[model samples]
Target: YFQGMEKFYNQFQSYPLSLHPNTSLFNTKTKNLAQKYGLRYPSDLSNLTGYVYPYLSPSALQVSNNWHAFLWFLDDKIDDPDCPKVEKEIILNHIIEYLSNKCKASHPITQFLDDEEMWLQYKESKCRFECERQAILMIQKGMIPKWDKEDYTVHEYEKIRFYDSGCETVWPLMFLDDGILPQYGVYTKFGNTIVCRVNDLYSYAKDVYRDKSNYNYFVYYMQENNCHLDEVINIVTEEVKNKWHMLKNANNNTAERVNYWCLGNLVWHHASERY
Candidate 1:
């Protein structure tokens, strides 16, 4: 799931949005439309529409983890040798159509759905999908088999919630939360911090919803505690400051090492260095 989202985001400048063109249409028609009416767009549309798309509902999770496992199913199709025949625009249009129908059926943004039902479904689907998606990818990539060959399917009474997506491979120490784990690496030091900053900035309300039991953590840590409007601002400033310092301090050899590692990962993964 993390790899897929990372892959998706790297290809597109933003989550989901960068996956397709026609940003103006989505922004103007769907996002703005939802705001004007004070109604949520359907779940499927929310991601594509750039609205606060919540997780999928429980029932949908039963079918598949929203679309994470489905991506594995799509791997053969999307990665097929003949895929080059289809134009990118054509593929995106089909995706849009699929999402439109999906949103109407069982997404959090569906105005007609009951709020409690929506919350239950969205949370369950998102959590289940993420867990299963990570497990599936690991197995598929031969990193490890499904833990104890556990059934990856959703259960009726399952409660939806977030869990680590790519912790083991990307940040194993932090993922394990062992006593020796440092607070300065992926979880709080590097990419995780950057990722959280971006997510909090773009997903304020969603973060609040997830942190309802400790809403002040989200609010105060990002805003009040930092004496900044938000963590996003703080991180962005730091990023700029770091960039200037690097430009001044990095010698040619040091700069080459940095650029090479950056570009190497992208090339290794058949990706671009946008992120």
Candidate 2:
């Protein structure tokens, strides 16, 4: 599945940032919270999330990492083997309520951090909750175990998987300012596309071998086109490279942040076993 990935990844290895200094502290806090919630603690994700946001202060980084951990935990709960369809929908609704400020935190981890400032920042942004709501809704709709290759065209599959990637929430935490930009909508689409494509490329074999129900772009491509795994990888590799180029030419500060995300994701995928 990853026949030529090393050479492809080398092209984007020029990123020069390091992990946040408080990453260890953030990881410890997240691990404790995961234990409290009976959630699987993805330590690799904790490290990757903190490493991607090197521009944040220690407190901000910790908060951001906590959010990252929480989202992963939420995902796991929804996708758990024992979770029923009703339970998944209930979890999704609860997340929407929390994000919408309609309810108080029900879990210790949810209440541990103060999101007042983050919400204020989100409200002040041009994109606001629309992007967030859309991402959440897509997740609710796309996480089901019933996607057949014949049921969707390539474009439809891409759109669903892109939204399901849930990279939209990560962008706001990366910026220390208003966390919103005029080009934020376009930036997020391109950035999330790159994130999803690269992820599918690297995780192809793992997902296939495990026979997971999650949507994998490479798997979909193989089923639709009747092609080899490496062929699908090559196609996705080109798509990722093109998106990176498009992001570079975005000609805005947000582009730089997206670049950091891409580079950080690539580096973390190399180091983490989660992929």
User: What's the CA error at residue 155 for candidate 2, in Å?
Assistant: 1.6
Per-residue lDDT over 79-165 for candidate 2, one digit per residue giving the tens place of the 0 to 100 score: 566867686666666666776778887754345323453233444444445445654665555554223233666777776676566
TM-scores of the candidates in the order shown: 0.25, 0.81
> 28-145 in candidate 1: lDDT tens per residue?
3443334443543333322221221112222332222223222322333333445563442244334334334443323222231223322233434333333334443433332222
Clashing pairs in model 1, backbone N/Cα/C closer than 3 A: 41-109, 56-121, 56-122, 57-121, 57-122, 58-121, 184-189
Which stretches of model 2 miss by more than 4 angstroms? 19-22, 36-40, 107-135, 138-150, 178-182, 212-214
What lDDT does model 2 reach? Answer: 0.66
Best-matching candidate per lDDT: 2
- Per-residue lDDT, model 2, residue 4, is 71
| lDDT, residue 273, candidate 2 | 71
What's the CA RMSD for each of the models? 19.4, 3.7
